[PDB]
Design a protein around this ligand. Structure first.
Ligand SMILES: C=CC1=C(C)/C(=C/c2[nH]c(Cc3[nH]c(/C=C4\NC(=O)C(C)=C4C=C)c(C)c3CCC(=O)O)c(CCC(=O)O)c2C)NC1=O
Ligand SMILES: C=CC1=C(C)/C(=C/c2[nH]c(Cc3[nH]c(/C=C4\NC(=O)C(C)=C4C=C)c(C)c3CCC(=O)O)c(CCC(=O)O)c2C)NC1=O
Lengths: 455, 459
């Protein structure tokens, strides 16, 4: 599945025409199969003929001036005419042979400028998600538009949705990482927009399948007409999705998420709308990456500040004054266990249970800092106090002196709603606290030296 | 003072257009610019609490209602009433601005080519030169300058495309006083601004207050809004009789301005205006992407330097020998040219012994923080003037304030020659001051203190 090269299917979607054209002669090296019905010329009539076979010398002068540019895509939304049939066209190099793609014409900043400032006023990522799904639905008119964030395991989840009122909601449904394989994620990373105008499309083959000069298969990663994987066309047929459009939300040059637009009737997206939506991806990708670092750096500076108030306080100021020890790592409870002395704070396991956990940590843990979001899986007795200390951060200030600090977090029962995973599927996570942030555990490890310093 | 001027409600508008403040949804023309009688054939008193239908054809107000049904009217701008109309709701009454209506295939083609050239850039300076060149090629203004703002809100001409004979204002800093806070906010709201004729006589709106609510007409969204007198006096002072500006915006803050200037009067059509405004939006997103990626690269390499330093401290008998002798060393962490780990251990271009000893004396006697930094050590410690050549910028890292365990970084003085346009030329020499410390460098210094204490307590 991840081994399958979707980027070189050897086929294209019927609605457009593909022409791999070598340069400088502009000889037509490769064509699709729908070159006849769409362009009139039969596929054998076009092969190895120079591009002047179907284009005017003035349009060819235009295309050659486009070839002079450092990147041809600066001119990309080209308009050619070939019965004065009109075609929007896409130009891009791949394996040297310039791919040209023709989609028939339909007879833009105002559409986006509302959305740009509407995104500029956002505060949280979820606001960006809801605003962008609503705006993409209003611009496109798709029956369904879902913002779909990837997680640390590259699982999907419908973080936002805007749909037909009669359609079922897929909100906050998780999907397995298998549903979007690695080659698909790479093509989404390299393509701002992906389009499947009709799920019932009969693929037209690229004849010859290989480039006549190089024998290499034609690379179609940047091709807007690239054939869909049947493994996904069958999935669209299962859902009734006769039209599909994905906008790749990218952050740190990697696929932060997707915006999927499913339409029950088959739907062709005008280039002026594709320009409006592909531009909206750059705005959403920037507003998300900017809002995310603000929530993280402000969280990181805040954890750094409460440690500073703790250091100036100093056992006295750790458990007493307003920025207390459990504020440092956002714990629910805490226990300072110095020798036979025990200082509880917040909600903690009873003193016998804490002494048992301390004997366990003295036997097992061999590091100054140890942390888990589910203590029950390593210290099974913790199941009795899962509701006060499902999560633990042990800070062994001194192994020989029996000096420990134990942060405690309550169980966080999670109800993960999958669309199947190896129909609806609830997954009930339990004995698991809210996971520790990395900076919280780093501040907890730093607190050991901050405690030793005040001797 | 100048920062407390309500420029958004002059009560007047630029003569070249006609403003009509109409109350929704009756299309009742509550307010008109006084110049209606000349360019419209209708006296200002003829359209007061009158329906808009008396002035516009019913075939055109039928489209206007379909525009008003939308959540945002601006999608329909410019309406074709021969006049170009701009509709935008503001302060109750919707505003209808009418301008005379002035093929153009090369214009849109080079517009998209300019958008692609902006997307092909890799540094902010390339975006600056490209956007000024393209806006000049699109508009024909005699002068086009990119005007980046300072953290002190000083301007600076970072890019310029001007006439061959015109003076170059490049690199000239300008005082923040030139752009008062309300003007900065209005430029943060209105993305494009035009004064077609600096010598214009303002057209008053009758009534000045809203007839139904005794409120000023909020011209903040108006494209015909009259300029404040001070800006027009400056336009007379340097003789540019027509101006355009494109707001560059990042994080909802005015990151800069693309100032256009013309010796002759110029009347930019709404099509070229909207194209330049979209180019400014593209330039804003591109500059934000470049700056964020550059900050991410510098932060990642600084974290890698810190990780290598921690690995050296964990793989050497004394951590000072892993911080100094090994490469990357402690200088790589904060981009310093000198260092001194206090005993004492020098590294690189540092003040000589007894000079650094006096610096540690002043540090123990005065500084009262875990970490301290300044780009001009001499102005808080005069003795540093004797060694400003090697240590004008300092980072004092208080590993242990009590027993005097310190780490100091040093930067040489970098003399700056700030060529000001005002308090004509006003060159200002800045000395006794090193290059400014970047915030991530100070963060790396504090993280180095924490990692040093951790590896020390490992012993
Ligand atoms: C309710 C459940 C549910 C799931 C799981 C789901 C997954 C899923 N699979 C794909 C495409 C999707 N899926 C696959 C491949 C596979 N995927 C597989 O599960 C297997 C076995 C293969 C094949 C080996 C590919 C290669 C692509 C990308 C195709 C393209 O965009 O051209 C998308 C993107 C759809 C679009 O952009 O139009 C989604 C959301 N959608 C849903 O609604
Ligand atoms: C020779 C070069 C040159 C300079 C330096 C210049 C100044 C200048 N001052 C302002 C803002 C600027 N400046 C002021 C005000 C003031 N101005 C003052 O000198 C004082 C003392 C005040 C305050 C009382 C205002 C009110 C505005 C905003 C005007 C507006 O758009 O409403 C702009 C941006 C306005 C626009 O986009 O047209 C410019 C270009 N224009 C030029 O052509």
């Amino acid at each position: 599945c991840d081994k399958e090269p979707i980027h070189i299917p050897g086929f294209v979607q019927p609605h457009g025409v593909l022409l791999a054209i070598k340069e400088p002669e502009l000889t037509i090296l490769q064509v699709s199969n729908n070159t006849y019905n769409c362009l009139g010329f039969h596929p054998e009539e076009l092969l190895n003929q120079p591009l002047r076979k179907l284009l005017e010398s003035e349009q060819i002068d235009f295309l050659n001036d486009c070839l002079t540019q450092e990147d041809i895509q600066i001119v990309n939304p080209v308009e050619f005419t070939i019965e004065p049939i009109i075609f929007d066209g896409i130009i891009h190099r791949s394996n040297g042979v310039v791919i040209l793609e023709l989609e028939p014409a339909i007879l833009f900043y105002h559409l986006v400028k509302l959305a740009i400032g509407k995104l500029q006023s956002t505060k949280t990522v979820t606001e960006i998600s809801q605003i962008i799904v609503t705006e993409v639905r209003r611009i496109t008119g798709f029956d369904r538009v879902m913002f779909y964030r990837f997680d640390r395991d590259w699982n999907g989840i419908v973080i936002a949705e805007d749909k037909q009122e009669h359609l079922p909601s897929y909100l906050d449904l998780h999907y397995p990482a298998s549903d979007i394989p690695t080659p698909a994620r790479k093509l989404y990373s390299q393509n701002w927009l992906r389009l499947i105008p009709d799920a019932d499309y009969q693929a037209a083959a690229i004849v010859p399948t290989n480039n006549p000069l190089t024998d290499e298969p034609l690379d179609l990663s940047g091709s807007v007409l690239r054939s869909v994987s049947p493994c996904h066309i069958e999935y669209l047929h299962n859902m009734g999705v006769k039209a599909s459009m994905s906008i790749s939300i990218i952050k740190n040059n990697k696929l932060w998420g997707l915006i999927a637009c499913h339409h029950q009737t088959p739907k062709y997206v005008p280039y002026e709308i594709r320009h409006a939506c592909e531009f909206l991806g750059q705005v959403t990708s920037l507003e998300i990456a900017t809002k995310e670092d603000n929530e993280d750096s402000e969280s990181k500076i805040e954890i750094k500040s409460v440690l500073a108030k703790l250091v100036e306080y100093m056992i006295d100021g750790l458990i007493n004054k307003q920025p207390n020890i459990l504020n440092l790592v956002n714990a629910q409870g805490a226990a300072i266990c110095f020798n036979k002395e025990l200082y509880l704070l917040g909600n903690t396991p009873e003193k016998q249970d804490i002494q048992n956990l301390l004997l366990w940590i003295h036997n097992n843990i061999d590091e100054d800092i140890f942390y888990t979001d589910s203590l029950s899986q390593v210290y099974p007795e913790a199941e009795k106090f899962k509701d006060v200390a499902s999560g633990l951060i042990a800070l062994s200030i001194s192994k020989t002196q029996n000096k420990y600090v134990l942060w405690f977090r309550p169980e966080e029962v999670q109800t993960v709603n999958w669309g199947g995973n190896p129909e609806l599927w609830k997954e009930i996570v339990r004995l698991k606290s809210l996971p520790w942030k990395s900076y919280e555990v780093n501040a907890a490890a730093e607190l050991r030296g901050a405690i030793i310093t005040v001797v």
